[PDB]
Write a protein that binds this ligand. Sequence first.
Ligand SMILES: Nc1ncnc2c1ncn2[C@@H]1O[C@H](COP(=O)(O)O)[C@@H](O)[C@H]1O
Ligand SMILES: [Mg+2]
Ligand SMILES: [Mg+2]
Lengths: 394, 394
Amino acid sequence: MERAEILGVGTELLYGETLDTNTAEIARSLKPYALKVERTLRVADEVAPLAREVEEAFARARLVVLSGGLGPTPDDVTREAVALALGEPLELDEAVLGEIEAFFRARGRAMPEANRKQAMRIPSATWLKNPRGTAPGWWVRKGGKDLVLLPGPPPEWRPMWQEVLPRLGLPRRPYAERVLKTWGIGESEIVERLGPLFVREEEVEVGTYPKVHGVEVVVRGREDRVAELAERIKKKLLKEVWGEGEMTLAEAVKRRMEREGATLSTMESLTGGLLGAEITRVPGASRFYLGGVVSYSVGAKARFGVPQDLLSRTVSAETARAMAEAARSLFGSTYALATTGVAGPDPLEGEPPGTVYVALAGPTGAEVRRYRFPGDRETVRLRSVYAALALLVT
Amino acid sequence: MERAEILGVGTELLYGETLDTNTAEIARSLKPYALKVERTLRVADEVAPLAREVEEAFARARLVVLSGGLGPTPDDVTREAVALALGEPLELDEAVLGEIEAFFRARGRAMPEANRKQAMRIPSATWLKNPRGTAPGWWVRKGGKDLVLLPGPPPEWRPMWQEVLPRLGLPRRPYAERVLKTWGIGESEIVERLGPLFVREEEVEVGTYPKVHGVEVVVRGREDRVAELAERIKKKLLKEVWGEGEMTLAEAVKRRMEREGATLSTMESLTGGLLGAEITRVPGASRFYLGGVVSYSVGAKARFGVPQDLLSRTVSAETARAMAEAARSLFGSTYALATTGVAGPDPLEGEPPGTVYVALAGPTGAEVRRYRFPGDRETVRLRSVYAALALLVT
Ligand SMILES: Nc1ncnc2c1ncn2[C@@H]1O[C@H](COP(=O)(O)O)[C@@H](O)[C@H]1O
Ligand SMILES: [Mg+2]
Ligand SMILES: [Mg+2]
């Protein structure tokens, strides 16, 4: 399989002063083709380093795509870099120069001298029309290789890329991917359960990505291999998979409450309202979520029904159970969730940061899960939210 | 100036399944140092291409920083690729292994076999301790050059990076950035109001950056020029500036409550818990924040003290005042904040998304502000949270 190289040009991209979504978006558009994307680059607006990166990318790849630096400014140098990298001179296209003059005439302005350089192309390039912006793009076919220069602004380049891409004659490969969202199983145990199913090959691969909402498992590559492989993986992870694709825990909870015609409330200590925030992130939450309380002080815990004998051990399974039962009673909801624990940075009741209990109470009784989350304060808080949501969808 | 190279390791980063903020963040951290950043890379989880990219970056750089791929799975291959790129064997460190085992034992687990590879290093590497994870990093000093391997999760690498960075003996340059945070004033009015102070030179520059917590005025460049210009700006915007640097509205509130010896409580509808989440984000919040109610249904509103007469008209200044008064009497706090209004996507009571009332109730009475916020549901929720906090600190 041959390579695709993707370079986003712009000094500000290095520093995240513009968030580089271009290179990712181009990479995802190449999924249907038999090309390997091994890396993406973001490159400073300097002609010599950029020419070097372009020359190296072009040498190793069937396709090179560059985005950005097609402006009129001294910091727009991609055309110069590309010409330098490919050993071709820049040539003024008078007709395209006329088009750029027209762009400014149409807005009531003369063309600035600076923009004149946007009418430059190398002999190996055909123009890609840009009816939304000043700078036409290039399509270079050289050596059985393709190099495409696109403008930085998405509303400019997306239609240009969409039209040129099926013209490049790229090898096609029937592609699929399957994303499995788990909870309550760490990467190590997933490794062990999958064994040889944890395939890393050219035709198909398996990846795990640990998130605050649990470990995601992604199978991607050839459509035949993916469907089979991912189905075996799902069967092996069956109890821990709570959703696939775009599903989120908050959406999964909503689906269960709608399926049952049930309602929900919450009582939170350490998460501070973040659980209610996460449940109500999803439009239509008011159909099942009656509301909640944030029992942050001891006085509030007692006010909302935590038994007095548990106030010395609010970090405990017993208190979690009591809080969920109290919320269920206080709101008259079908179910209720509770969070209690040690966020960090300090211990609480002799328990170390990351000690968390979550509880769910319902018409058949309550249940509690204990966690010892590694992470700083903000992290432990977030895992706690998802742990509590996970009690509803296992 | 010598080069710093920065590689984010992760197949998911290429496709933007996780947006790579790590490389940009590390690049920003290096601005006080006289190292050039010509490019940044994201690299797939594949050992041969990764080893090639690492070998090349190390050859050309004074400093190489890798982020990610230190997990226990077959797609975590950074250690092996670095070992290949530097020509050194990986060797199990029995001591680190003992620490990982202890880490799992504390959590009530035996250490899984797949974790063993996290205690592997090359002879040139010293360990960088990761108290928040099972993967410690590496610092390799070899031939006058540094290569640092960090965990992917920002809560994990950030403290590790902060501590090793001064120890690298990198050449310094006098750079600084000052961030002035304002509320209640648009970019246009700021630009216009500073005027000659809105400098954009090679030495120093002033930028405006709209955020959900108000428009930031960032001054950056040569330390001396930054510091002087920043003082002159904060004077021109003295009415508008509520904080600088790492100050947040939630920390400002905490400083005010502690200074008064006062307490706070909340009652929230559209924000769904997010306001109590943001207050409690800051360590020490239990010294003043008593707790809150998420009144997300008519039944919850009534039960916690909102008058029957208002329950049908939730998008109103009267409802926001009554909520803040109901929270303050329920929790007995010195102050109480409330949010009500239209998050989106749907209109409510004839009012569009973005129509929000925030209220504060205090010793001397209640105050309400109406906003009309731009943005999608999550954005309106966020801006509402800050607008409620702003009542206390602007
Ligand atoms: N790599 C990139 N990813 C996403 N957006 C980009 C990129 N490069 C430029 N832009 C967008 O193009 C516009 C500014 O480009 P410029 O002003 O030419 O640097 C803004 O809308 C940017 O967000
Ligand atoms: Mg640019
Ligand atoms: Mg990874």
